Ligand SMILES: *[C@@H]1O[C@H](CO)[C@@H](O)[C@H](O)[C@H]1NC(C)=O
C-alpha cells in the first residue's frame with residue numbers, strides 16, 4: 174500500500190531556509206514522479222514542482238525559480254524539499270503528492286491520489302506590536318426605546334491573537350468579536366461590537382478589555398457617545 | 402485559468418452541494434476534498450470518474466468549459482473545502498460549511514465614523530456592522546460621495562451563533578486622513594434577503 | 610482486416626562474425642541476417658492512427674539494450690541495493706550498429722509516411738513492411754545522436770504539450786555534427802566541437818517551430834534545473850568511455866536574437882563512477898584508455914522539458930531533458946506500430 178510520510182512541522186523567521194523530507198513506500202520508487210504542493214488558508218493550492226527519482230530530474234514552478242531545490246535519496250526512497258529566503262507568503266502546509274496511475278511503463282502525474290500527512294511551516298518575524306484601540310461611537314440616532322450598537326476597533330497588531338471582553342467579562346449578551354483580518358501592512362486588526370439598550374448609554378459604563386499576550390499588552394478603552 | 406465558484410457554501414445535512422469550475426483549456430479535471438486538519442483527498446478525476454472509497458453521492462459533470470461537482474445528501478464527512486484541478490493549476494476553492502436552518506432574519510445595519518483619536522494618526526477607518534441576520538449570503542458595498550468603492554475594504558464574518566442561528570458581518574473601509582477629509586458622504590449599502598430593498602446607513606463628515 | 614496488437618519481435622542486422630565489437634557480438638547471437646530485398650507495400654485509401662508514446666515496440670528494444678549493456682559494459686564495481694558486486698571490467702570495442710526490428714508470422718508493421726507526422730494521430734500515407742529501418746541503440750541525454758532526420762520541417766513531438774511532465778522531442782530536418790575528443794598527452798578531461806554558425810541557425814529554426822505551438826510567445830532556453838550529471842550534462846558513451854559534456858553554450862539565447870559566429874567548444878569529462886540509466890544504481894569502470902579518444906556524431910534531435918507553474922508571463926522556457934532512454938527509441942520508432950492479421 175502506497176504511503177508518503179513527511180517530516181515534522183517547524184517555525185522559521187524571514188530570511189531563513191526550510192528543508193522537509195518525504196519518505197515513500199509501497200511501490201517502485203523510480204516509476205512515478207513526486208510533486209510538492211503547498212496549501213495556505215484562503216489562497217489556492219500552489220504546485221511547487223515535481224521530481225523524477227530516476228536521475229533526480231526536476232521541474233520547478235516559474236514563480237519559485239531560484240529559491241526551491243528538490244532532491245532524493247535512492248537507498249531510503251526519500252524525496253527532499255528546500256525553500257530558501259522565506260517570507261510571510263511562504264507560511265503554509267506543505268504536501269508531497271504522487272499520481273494515482275503509476276506503472277513501470279506509464280504514469281499520469283496530476284491525479285493526486287496519494288498525499289503526505291502534511292508539514293505545517295510558519296514563517297513570521299519575532300517582533301511584536303501592541304494594538305491600537307479606537308472606540309466605536311454608537312451614533313446619535315436609532316430610536317428612543319430600541320437598540321443601539323457600540324464597540325472598539327483593535328487595529329494594527331502583530332501577531333495573532335487578541336481577545337476582547339466587555340466590562341471585565343460582566344457583559345456577554347449581544348457581544349460579537351469578529352475574526353481578525355490581515356491588512357496590506359502585514360498587521361492584523363479586528364472589531365468587537367455589542368448591542369445595548371439605548372436608554373442605558375447615559376447610565377451604564379461600557380469598557381472593552383483588549384488583551385494581546387505576545388506583546389504583554391492589556392488596554393482598557395471606555396466607549397462613550399461623542400458630545401457635540 | 403481555473404475559476405471556481407462559489408467561494409462559500411453554507412448548507413444543511415441532507416441537502417446538495419453544487420460546486421462549479423470553469424477552465425480556459427480542456428483537459429483532465431480533478432476534484433479534491435480537504436477535511437479540517439487533514440490532507441486533501443482525491444474525489445473525482447478525469448471529469449466524472451469516481452475515486453476509490455467515494456460514494457455515488459459525489460457526481461461529476463461537464464457542460465462546455467464548466468465542470469460541476471454535485472454532492473447529494475450531505476453528511477458530516479462531506480463538509481470541508483473543495484478544489485478543482487487541471488495539471489498544476491488549482492481553483493480558489495469552495496468552502497462547504499454546516500448551516501443550521503432558521504427563519505429569514507434581516508440585519509441591523511450600523512455605521513461607525515472614524516474616531517478623533519485615530520484621525521491623529523493619519524489614517525481613518527469607517528466600520529459598517531451587519532448584526533444578527535440569516536441566511537449568511539449578504540453583500541456590502543461602500544459609497545463615498547455616491548461613488549462605488551473597491552479594494553479599500555475588508556470583511557469579517559462570525560460563525561453561526563449557537564443560540565439564534567444568525568450571522569454577523571463587519572466591513573471596514575480604510576482611507577488616509579488626507580483622502581478622508583476630501584469627501585463628505587460616507588455610506589455602506591446592505592443587500593439581504595430579509596430586506597425588501599437595499600438598506601443604506603450613512604453620515605456626513607463634520608456634522609453630528 | 611487487422612487490428613493493433615503486441616507481440617515478441619525478432620531482431621535483424623548486418624553483424625559480422627569477425628568483429629569483436631560489442632554490438633556486433635550481441636547481434637550475432639540475438640539477431641538474424643537482414644534481407645537484401647525488403648518488400649514495402651504502400652497502402653491506398655488507408656488511414657491509421659498512431660501513438661508513439663504508447664508503442665510497445667519501444668518496450669522491447671529497451672530490454673535488448675539493457676541486456677546488451679549488462680553483458681558487455683560490466684563495471685568493475687556494481688553498487689546496488691546496498692550490496693557491492695565486484696566483477697571483471699576489461700576494455701572493449703564499443704560502436705553501435707543499425708538494428709532492425711521485425712514481426713513474426715501473422716503480424717506486420719504499419720509505417721506512417723506522412724512527412725510532417727508528429728507522432729500521434731491519423732496517418733494518410735501508410736505502408737506495410739516486415740522490418741523497421743536500421744536503428745542504432747545510441748544511449749544519450751539532452752542530444753539525440755546518429756539518428757534519423759525529419760523529412761521536411763522540424764517536427765515537435767510530445768504526448769501532450771500542455772502537460773509539463775511530458776518530455777518534448779525536437780526532430781531536426783538537418784543534422785549538426787558534434788566532434789568530441791579526448792587527446793593524448795588530467796587524462797579525464799575532454800571536449801566537444803560544434804560549428805556555431807550551423808547550430809545557432811538550426812537552434813533559431815527550433816524556436817520558430819516552437820512559436821507555432823505556443824501562440825508566438827518568446828521562446829527562452831535555460832540549463833537544467835537540477836538532477837544527476839547524466840541529465841544536467843550531455844551524457845553519452847564513446848569508445849567505451851562515459852562522457853559528460855556541459856551544454857550551457859549550446860543553448861545560448863543571445864546567439865539566436867554578433868559574436869557567437871564561430872566554434873563552440875563544450876567542456877567534457879570522462880567519469881569512472883556513473884549513475885546507470887538502467888536504474889540499477891551506481892557503477893564504476895576502469896580509467897580511460899590511452900591515445901586519442903574521438904567520436905564524431907550527428908545531432909539529429911533534442912530532448913527538452915518545458916517549465917510550468919501558475920504564472921502569466923509572455924515567454925516559454927525550455928530546458929535540455931533526457932534520462933528516460935525509452936524516449937530515445939520513441940524518436941526512431943514513432944512511425945511504426947504492430948498489427949495482427951485477422
Ligand atoms: C493529451 O491529454 C489529454 C488529457 O490531459 C488526453 O485526453 C489526450 O488524449 C492526450 N493527447 C494525446 C495525443 O495523447
Ligand SMILES: *[C@@H]1O[C@H](CO)[C@@H](O)[C@H](O)[C@H]1NC(C)=O
Nearest residue numbers: 722723724725726733734735
Ligand atoms: C501523402 O501522399 C499523397 C499522394 O502522393 C501526397 O499528395 C501527400 O503530400 C502525402 N502526404 C504527406 C504528409 O507526405
Ligand SMILES: *[C@@H]1O[C@H](CO)[C@@H](O)[C@H](O)[C@H]1NC(C)=O
Nearest residue numbers: 727729730731765766767770
Ligand atoms: C499532432 O497532430 C495531432 C493531429 O491529430 C494533434 O491532435 C496533436 O495536438 C499534434 N501534436 C503536436 C505536439 O503538435
Ligand SMILES: *[C@@H]1O[C@H](CO)[C@@H](O)[C@H](O)[C@H]1NC(C)=O
Nearest residue numbers: 755756757758783784906907
Ligand atoms: C550524419 O549525417 C549525414 C548528413 O545528414 C549523413 O550523410 C550520415 O550518414 C550521418 N551519419 C550517420 C547516420 O552515422
Ligand SMILES: *[C@@H]1O[C@H](CO)[C@@H](O)[C@H](O)[C@H]1NC(C)=O
Nearest residue numbers: 761762763764782783814818
Ligand atoms: C527544416 O524545417 C524548417 C521549418 O521548421 C524549414 O524552415 C527549413 O527550410 C527546413 N530545412 C531543410 C528542408 O533543409
Ligand SMILES: *[C@@H]1O[C@H](CO)[C@@H](O)[C@H](O)[C@H]1NC(C)=O
Nearest residue numbers: 788789790792800802903905
Ligand atoms: C575533431 O577535432 C579534432 C581536434 O579536437 C580534429 O583533430 C579532428 O580532425 C576533428 N574531426 C573532424 C571530423 O572534424
Ligand SMILES: *[C@@H]1O[C@H](CO)[C@@H](O)[C@H](O)[C@H]1NC(C)=O
Nearest residue numbers: 803804805806807808871872
Ligand atoms: C561553420 O559552417 C559554415 C557553414 O554553415 C562554414 O561556412 C564555416 O566555415 C564553418 N566554420 C568553421 C570554423 O569551420
Ligand SMILES: *[C@@H]1O[C@H](CO)[C@@H](O)[C@H](O)[C@H]1NC(C)=O
Nearest residue numbers: 832841842855856857858876
Ligand atoms: C556548465 O558551465 C557553466 C559555465 O562555466 C557553469 O556555469 C555551469 O555550472 C556548468 N554546469 C554544471 C552542471 O556544472
Ligand SMILES: *[C@@H]1O[C@H](CO)[C@@H](O)[C@H](O)[C@H]1NC(C)=O
Nearest residue numbers: 857858861863864867868869
Ligand atoms: C553567449 O554568447 C555570448 C556572445 O558570444 C557570450 O558573450 C556569452 O558568454 C555566451 N553565454 C553562454 C552562457 O555561453
Ligand SMILES: *[C@@H]1O[C@H](CO)[C@@H](O)[C@H](O)[C@H]1NC(C)=O
Nearest residue numbers: 747754755846904905906907
Ligand atoms: C556516430 O557516428 C559514427 C557512426 O556512424 C561513429 O563513429 C560515432 O562514434 C557515433 N557516435 C556515437 C556516440 O555512437
